[PDB]
Protein backbone atom coordinates (compact mmCIF):
# COMPACT_ATOMS: atom_id res chain seq x y z
CA UNK A 1 0.00 0.00 0.00
CA UNK A 2 1.25 3.45 -1.02
CA UNK A 3 -0.28 6.52 0.66
CA UNK A 4 0.20 10.16 -0.26
CA UNK A 5 2.19 12.17 2.26
CA UNK A 6 1.35 15.61 3.62
CA UNK A 7 4.04 17.12 1.37
CA UNK A 8 3.17 16.48 -2.30
CA UNK A 9 4.08 14.76 -4.56
CA UNK A 10 5.58 12.19 -2.17
CA UNK A 11 4.06 8.88 -1.10
CA UNK A 12 4.99 6.24 1.49
CA UNK A 13 4.99 2.46 1.14
CA UNK A 14 3.22 1.60 4.37
CA UNK A 15 4.93 -0.76 6.85
CA UNK A 16 3.30 -3.90 8.20
CA UNK A 17 0.33 -3.09 10.42
CA UNK A 18 -0.73 0.09 8.57
CA UNK A 19 -3.18 -1.11 5.90
CA UNK A 20 -4.98 2.21 5.41
CA UNK A 21 -4.39 5.64 3.94
CA UNK A 22 -5.89 8.64 5.72
CA UNK A 23 -6.31 12.37 5.22
CA UNK A 24 -6.98 14.81 8.07
CA UNK A 25 -8.75 18.12 7.42
CA UNK A 26 -10.67 20.77 9.29
CA UNK A 27 -14.43 20.28 9.07
CA UNK A 28 -14.85 23.41 6.91
CA UNK A 29 -11.83 22.93 4.58
CA UNK A 30 -11.73 19.52 2.85
CA UNK A 31 -9.05 20.75 0.42
CA UNK A 32 -6.44 21.70 3.05
CA UNK A 33 -4.85 18.52 4.46
CA UNK A 34 -3.52 18.78 8.00
CA UNK A 35 -2.22 15.20 8.26
CA UNK A 36 -1.89 12.67 5.46
CA UNK A 37 -0.28 9.24 5.17
CA UNK A 38 -0.42 5.63 6.30
CA UNK A 39 -2.34 4.60 9.42
CA UNK A 40 -3.51 1.41 11.12
CA UNK A 41 -7.03 2.32 12.30
CA UNK A 42 -9.21 5.08 10.89
CA UNK A 43 -9.58 7.90 13.45
CA UNK A 44 -13.12 8.86 14.38
CA UNK A 45 -14.11 12.31 13.16
CA UNK A 46 -14.81 14.99 15.76
CA UNK A 47 -16.64 18.32 16.03
CA UNK A 48 -13.67 20.10 14.40
CA UNK A 49 -11.83 17.39 12.43
CA UNK A 50 -12.88 15.12 9.56
CA UNK A 51 -10.95 11.93 8.76
CA UNK A 52 -11.13 10.18 5.38
CA UNK A 53 -9.66 6.69 5.07
CA UNK A 54 -9.12 4.37 2.11
CA UNK A 55 -7.14 1.24 1.24
CA UNK A 56 -5.87 1.66 -2.34
CA UNK A 57 -2.64 3.10 -3.70
CA UNK A 58 -2.38 6.91 -3.51
CA UNK A 59 -6.08 7.14 -2.63
CA UNK A 60 -5.72 9.80 0.08
Amino acid sequence: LKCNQLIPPFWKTCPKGKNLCYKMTMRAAPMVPVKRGCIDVCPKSSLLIKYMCCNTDKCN
Partner: protein
Protein backbone atom coordinates in the same frame (compact mmCIF):
# COMPACT_ATOMS: atom_id res chain seq x y z
CA UNK B 1 -33.93 7.24 15.52
CA UNK B 2 -33.58 5.00 12.48
CA UNK B 3 -30.54 3.02 11.34
CA UNK B 4 -27.00 3.63 12.65
CA UNK B 5 -26.21 5.29 9.32
CA UNK B 6 -29.26 7.55 9.60
CA UNK B 7 -28.49 8.46 13.21
CA UNK B 8 -24.95 9.41 12.15
CA UNK B 9 -26.27 11.58 9.31
CA UNK B 10 -28.53 13.42 11.75
CA UNK B 11 -25.59 14.16 14.05
CA UNK B 12 -23.63 15.40 11.04
CA UNK B 13 -26.54 17.73 10.29
CA UNK B 14 -26.59 19.07 13.85
CA UNK B 15 -22.83 19.68 13.80
CA UNK B 16 -22.96 21.49 10.45
CA UNK B 17 -25.95 23.56 11.61
CA UNK B 18 -23.92 24.84 14.57
CA UNK B 19 -21.23 26.30 12.31
CA UNK B 20 -23.75 27.67 9.80
CA UNK B 21 -25.46 29.70 12.54
CA UNK B 22 -22.11 31.28 13.46
CA UNK B 23 -21.52 34.77 12.08
CA UNK B 24 -17.84 34.01 11.47
CA UNK B 25 -15.58 30.97 11.89
CA UNK B 26 -11.81 31.21 12.37
CA UNK B 27 -9.66 28.08 12.61
CA UNK B 28 -6.11 27.57 13.86
CA UNK B 29 -3.88 24.48 13.87
CA UNK B 30 -0.77 24.49 16.07
CA UNK B 31 1.73 21.70 16.68
CA UNK B 32 4.83 21.53 18.87
CA UNK B 33 6.75 18.50 20.20
CA UNK B 34 4.16 15.89 19.26
CA UNK B 35 1.38 18.02 20.79
CA UNK B 36 -1.25 19.27 18.35
CA UNK B 37 -3.86 21.93 19.15
CA UNK B 38 -6.95 22.47 16.98
CA UNK B 39 -8.81 25.70 17.76
CA UNK B 40 -12.03 26.94 16.16
CA UNK B 41 -13.43 30.34 17.13
CA UNK B 42 -17.11 31.02 16.47
CA UNK B 43 -18.51 34.56 16.42
CA UNK B 44 -22.16 34.44 17.53
CA UNK B 45 -23.69 37.90 17.85
CA UNK B 46 -21.56 39.85 20.31
CA UNK B 47 -20.06 36.79 22.01
CA UNK B 48 -17.54 34.15 20.99
CA UNK B 49 -17.15 30.38 21.32
CA UNK B 50 -13.67 28.84 21.45
CA UNK B 51 -13.51 25.12 20.66
CA UNK B 52 -10.17 23.44 21.42
CA UNK B 53 -9.30 19.85 20.53
CA UNK B 54 -5.88 18.52 21.56
CA UNK B 55 -4.19 15.49 20.02
CA UNK B 56 -0.94 13.61 20.58
CA UNK B 57 1.03 12.68 17.46
CA UNK B 58 1.97 9.02 17.95
CA UNK B 59 3.88 7.42 15.06
CA UNK B 60 3.19 10.44 12.85
CA UNK B 61 -0.58 9.92 13.24
CA UNK B 62 -2.98 11.96 15.41
CA UNK B 63 -4.48 10.35 18.52
CA UNK B 64 -7.25 11.84 20.64
CA UNK B 65 -5.95 13.46 23.85
CA UNK B 66 -8.89 14.40 26.07
CA UNK B 67 -12.37 15.74 25.43
CA UNK B 68 -13.10 18.96 23.56
CA UNK B 69 -12.88 22.24 25.48
CA UNK B 70 -15.53 24.95 25.09
CA UNK B 71 -14.45 28.39 26.34
CA UNK B 72 -16.48 31.60 26.19
CA UNK B 73 -16.35 35.07 27.66
CA UNK B 74 -19.96 34.60 28.90
CA UNK B 75 -20.73 31.15 30.32
CA UNK B 76 -20.87 28.34 27.75
CA UNK B 77 -21.35 25.86 30.61
CA UNK B 78 -24.72 24.83 29.20
CA UNK B 79 -23.63 25.18 25.58
CA UNK B 80 -20.40 23.34 26.38
CA UNK B 81 -22.45 20.68 28.15
CA UNK B 82 -24.47 20.18 24.97
CA UNK B 83 -21.38 20.33 22.74
CA UNK B 84 -19.42 17.89 24.91
CA UNK B 85 -22.44 15.57 24.91
CA UNK B 86 -22.81 15.99 21.15
CA UNK B 87 -19.15 15.08 20.62
CA UNK B 88 -19.46 11.89 22.68
CA UNK B 89 -22.71 10.94 20.95
CA UNK B 90 -21.14 11.68 17.55
CA UNK B 91 -18.31 9.26 18.40
CA UNK B 92 -20.59 6.39 19.44
CA UNK B 93 -22.61 6.80 16.24
CA UNK B 94 -19.45 6.30 14.16
CA UNK B 95 -18.49 3.32 16.34
CA UNK B 96 -21.83 1.61 15.67
CA UNK B 97 -21.58 2.19 11.91
CA UNK B 98 -18.02 0.84 11.88
CA UNK B 99 -18.95 -2.24 13.91
CA UNK B 100 -21.71 -2.94 11.38
CA UNK B 101 -19.32 -2.70 8.42
Amino acid sequence: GGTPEERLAQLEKEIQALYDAADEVVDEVEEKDGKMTVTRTLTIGDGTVTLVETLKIVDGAPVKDGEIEVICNPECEELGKRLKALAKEYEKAQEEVEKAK
